[PDB]
Design a protein around this ligand. Structure first.
Ligand SMILES: [Ca+2]
Ligand SMILES: [Ca+2]
Ligand SMILES: [Ca+2]
Ligand SMILES: [Ca+2]
Ligand SMILES: [Ca+2]
Ligand SMILES: [Ca+2]
Ligand SMILES: [Ca+2]
Ligand SMILES: [Ca+2]
Ligand SMILES: [Ca+2]
Ligand SMILES: [Cl-]
Ligand SMILES: [Cl-]
Ligand SMILES: [Cl-]
Ligand SMILES: [Cl-]
Ligand SMILES: [K+]
Lengths: 111, 94, 100, 97, 96, 106, 99, 85
């Protein structure tokens, strides 16, 4: 018996390939799951996770905070055209809204 | 069968609490939504709409609770109900 | 010497900025909790609730209403008003498909 | 019987956070949001993948169904990167047998 | 000798004959009826599938169909649907 | 003279439904009642729509249901209309309806 | 003679006419050519089942008709009777089709 | 010319857009609506056709089918009865 390597480590991934494979088999999605499928899916979940954390991290930094909170995630997502589309029908608890006042409601004089 | 609402025990009967959704609170919600000025008719109308919203989410939540044979509504029940109604919520499980 | 007084709209704009910067729930917790319990009585008697289930519900209501008020604000402005009215809410819910 | 186990993606979320922002951390609630997000996109991808294989009279979800699912679900630039990252991972994985 | 494409059309006809024996149906209308049955099959089965999964069950039973039906149909439709489903299962298990 | 559908009192195919549940990636297993119940519900809803659309065909002096009759049936029924609120019926049209502000005075 | 319907009267007649019928209202060949053009941006030398082009047409027309209803309500909400681009825009923003 | 033959979009004629608006109960029509509608129709078909063609490529076909469109319409929240669902 060789000493064991995680499928994640062979894939060059932080996300759990083996757990993802298991969740695919036990999720009633198809009768059979190919060996590539959880590798690919795990990678995609990592990529998207990385992308949100990149932007929320920036939001945290901008706020003079070390830790990401739900608001930073909300600021990240809503200010990003693409994530906002992906999560267009999703509600982020304790996220708030983007500062946005309609122009007609600002007082006489401009900007 | 003996005992009706007090068949199952110990005093948990409810008021008319819709008025506890106050004018000031409704005005804060509207503020977060960018609203600057508010007709006096809005407050009672919002209570209507809030109530309808909760009826629909809670009805489904409780259906999931009855299906699982429980007597306690869980965050997941609500989460599943919200998803069904196309109002997916993040941060409470699932 | 007159007392100080902001003109109508100025404090409104201030409040808009305040609440748009924060994330804290804006309906008071106990009244909302009772309201939930009361509504659920119509579907099943002697229900318990996890506290997080009530918080889930409040988070989803407030976000729903803040969203609807956004749409409602747009409907008022479309009709060259600045004041939101029931017919604004009604139009937004009709266009959303919430209502016939 | 301590208290039955509850899986989560949070160790992996933390690991990726350290790659991207080494000196940044993350609240419990934010973590809860990230968990919600991962499970949501899992279901969407896996469900579309499930459908693809069903429309084509196939029993097997392969990396090809994951890929097409990703192209249908993700908006442009996210999709290009995701397809790239999932192509790299499979390739790498396969060559490391 | 072409594909062999199943549909609900013979069953749709049979039901039509029960409820309106002297009326017929165009092929496009039959197509819409076919679409409808598949759509509602899927909605119900999908919710049932979820119900079971949420509850760590491996089996979709008539109780998952019933809860799926209550979640999915509007009030009156669901009372009747539940009633017809029950009646059918009762009648099925008593028969033999 | 038995067939699963006949036992159950149904026109819809209990066996087909059972097979569709099993091969449809819904769960590991399907109990025996599930397809009876499901096929019953599908038949009930199918019967309602055909009852109403058959009536709409009669009302317009036709012997065959066409997509318009289905559309008239569905959209004038408040509950079928909700169940099918995000569905397009091909060749169905819309219901006659003109907002009152657009009508001329008296 | 100058026998002439007033502005609006033929419009209402047209409304009553099109609301009664279920036929496609866009001409078929021009629609079909549009489908094939748009499709070329995604993949070259594509063919189409006729029923595919018909399915696309049905969906489009249903979409536009339903969008015109909401647009009409938005115009009426602004005390007009004339649909304008800003009415379409508002319907689409509230429907969540656009930001 | 390339006004219809590579903006076949103009083949969506003013008369046709009015007919559509009529079936939607529209009485009166600003002249700017015909261009606006054309933009909207194009975005709609872009989105639907993108997805259908993605279904077509995945099946390794060169011919888009009605089912491709039906699946595409369903993804987009735009379910269609009558074409093979
Ligand atoms: Ca990566
Ligand atoms: Ca990155
Ligand atoms: Ca004025
Ligand atoms: Ca970095
Ligand atoms: Ca999901
Ligand atoms: Ca219901
Ligand atoms: Ca009915
Ligand atoms: Ca009648
Ligand atoms: Ca014509
Ligand atoms: Cl594979
Ligand atoms: Cl009003
Ligand atoms: Cl069963
Ligand atoms: Cl305009
Ligand atoms: K499934």
């Amino acid at each position: 018996r060789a000493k064991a390597k995680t499928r994640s480590s062979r894939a060059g991934l932080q996300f759990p390939v083996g757990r993802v494979h298991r969740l695919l088999r036990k999720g009633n999605y198809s009768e059979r799951v190919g060996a590539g499928a959880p590798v690919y899916l795990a990678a995609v979940l990592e990529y998207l996770t990385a992308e949100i954390l990149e932007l929320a991290g920036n939001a945290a930094r901008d706020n003079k905070k070390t830790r990401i909170i739900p608001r930073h995630l909300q600021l990240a997502i809503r200010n990003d055209e693409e994530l906002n589309k992906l999560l267009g029908r999703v509600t982020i608890a304790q996220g708030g809204v983007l500062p946005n006042i309609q122009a007609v409601l600002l007082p006489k004089k401009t900007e | 069968g003996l005992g009706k609402g007090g068949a199952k025990r110990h005093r948990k009967v409810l008021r008319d609490n819709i008025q506890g959704i106050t004018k000031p609170a409704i005005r804060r919600l509207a503020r977060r939504g960018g609203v600057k000025r508010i007709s006096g008719l809005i407050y009672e109308e919002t209570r209507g709409v809030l109530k309808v919203f909760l009826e629909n989410v809670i009805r489904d939540a409780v259906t999931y609770t009855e299906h699982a044979k429980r007597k306690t509504v869980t965050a997941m029940d609500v989460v599943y109900a919200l998803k069904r109604q196309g109002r997916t919520l993040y941060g409470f499980g699932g | 010497k007159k007392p100080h007084r902001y003109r109508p709209g100025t404090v409104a704009l201030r409040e808009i900025r305040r609440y748009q910067k924060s994330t804290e729930l804006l309906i008071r917790k106990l009244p909302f909790q009772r309201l939930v319990r009361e509504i659920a009585q119509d579907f099943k008697t002697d229900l318990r609730f996890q506290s997080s289930a009530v918080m889930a519900l409040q988070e989803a209501c407030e976000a729903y209403l803040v969203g609807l008020f956004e749409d409602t604000n747009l409907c008022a402005i479309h009709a060259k008003r600045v004041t939101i009215m029931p017919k604004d809410i009604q139009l937004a819910r009709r266009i959303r498909g919430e209502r016939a | 019987r301590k208290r039955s186990r509850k899986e989560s993606y949070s160790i992996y979320v933390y690991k990726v956070l350290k790659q991207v922002h080494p000196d940044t951390g993350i609240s419990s609630k934010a973590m809860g949001i990230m968990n919600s997000f991962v499970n949501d996109i899992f279901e969407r991808i896996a469900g579309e993948a499930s459908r693809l294989a069903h429309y084509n009279k196939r029993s097997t979800i392969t990396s090809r169904e994951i890929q097409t699912a990703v192209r249908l679900l993700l908006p442009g630039e996210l999709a290009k990167h995701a397809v790239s990252e999932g192509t790299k991972a499979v390739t790498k994985y396969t060559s490391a047998k």
